[PDB]
Amino acid sequence: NNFGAIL
Amino acid sequence: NNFGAIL
């Protein structure tokens, strides 16, 4: 799971 | 899991 920014 | 920024 992603809980931040993947720029 | 990602809890920060992956720029």
Next chain:
Amino acid sequence: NNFGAIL
């Protein structure tokens, strides 16, 4: 898991 910045 990542809890910081990966620039």
